[model samples]
Target: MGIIRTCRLGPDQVKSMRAALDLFGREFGDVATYSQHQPDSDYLGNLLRSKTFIALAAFDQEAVVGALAAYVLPKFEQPRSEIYIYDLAVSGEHRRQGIATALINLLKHEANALGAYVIYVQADYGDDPAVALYTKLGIREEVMHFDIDPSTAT
Candidate 1:
């Protein structure tokens, strides 16, 4: 058993962010690709310390078994903000025990405290566990996502 907690990471917790990024790399693969661009600790700590970023961690003693990172997007047309969950992963050994759900719940609390209007996340079609968890937690919207190449922009 462990605790789910949330924090806005600072320079002092770079090690913890590194562990979280390692977990993300294991679960999502692409994190490793991005880490190639910069030291994970430096990149992650810079993000966590930014005004728009939030991180939640599931800790078993001193080990980080699950984590989520989100961006708080303040709406220009309204008074509220929205949170877009960028990454969420739980260590394989800790799966099926509600650790992911607990991490999300903790993030919800943080979002509420920040006066965010909603929290949103996306899951790839074939990722059953992620799809199921998101479906169970919130309403589903059928939408298309596109990635644009920056190099092609004028």
Candidate 2:
């Protein structure tokens, strides 16, 4: 069986964390951006220590096969927080093995510990597996997403 470990990694675990990032880079098909543009040790250590950043990495032996990254957003309307999943993926060779579900399961507990009321993630159009996954896990919301280049800012 594989192992799922939450990644509020310590300074000494930077190597393990980098392996997880490499896994994400491969799964997302942007190894250069993820692998080449890696945060320096100081930056990464700070991110790993941040209270509002959540990461869960699945390991099969010493290899990282799946990973999930999320952010904890403190709500203004109420004294609660919400988890917004940024990226969740399992290596192609490791799919259909419940790794993704397990990641979410672990994250649910993390949110509860943080007093967060909800956890949300976005799936792009035409991604049936993601849509199906979300369908089974949470209520579906039809929403629009857009990107605004910061270079165009006034």
Candidate 3:
């Protein structure tokens, strides 16, 4: 087994994080377009500095093999905050070796440090592996999701 190191990313690692995100895009079938459109390192740095935004990566030697991005949401109904996992991916070559789990464990540590009450993530139907992983990590919740176009919103 390879050695995998998990850690939260900071502002100084923006460029490396972008490279890891490119790997995520490749593994998950999305176009790596954020760098082209949002190339401001300062903006990314600010985001890294925010307590609400969390980014973690699993590295093998010098390359990122897994990554997770999450948001800590402040709720009006409750005093405690919850974490919403926005994105998570492990490189194809590193799957099934606990890299993804390690990344999440690190995120959980961060959530505890930040006083987050819970951490949640969504997986699409038919994604058996993701479903299995999430099920193993947390209780399963059945819910409907609806997406609204900003252009159509008044």
From the highest lDDT down, the ranking of the candidates is 3, 2, 1
Ranking by TM-score: 3, 2, 1
lDDT of 2 by residue, 3-57 (tens): 6444444556678778878988897899997799899998878877888887788
Estimated TM-score for each candidate: 0.87, 0.91, 0.92
| lDDT value, candidate 2, whole model | 0.84
Model 2 alpha-carbon miss at residue 2, Å: 5.5
Clashing pairs in 3: none
lDDT of 1 by residue, 40-147 (tens): 556766786786888777788778888888889999998889999999998888898998998888888888788897999998899999999999999998899999
Model 3 lDDT per residue over 43-101, tens place = 88999888888889888887888889899998899788999998888888789988888
Query: What C-alpha lDDT values do all the predictions have?
Result: 0.81, 0.84, 0.84
RMSD of 2: 1.8
* Over 4 Å off, model 2: 1-11
lDDT of 1 at 103: 83
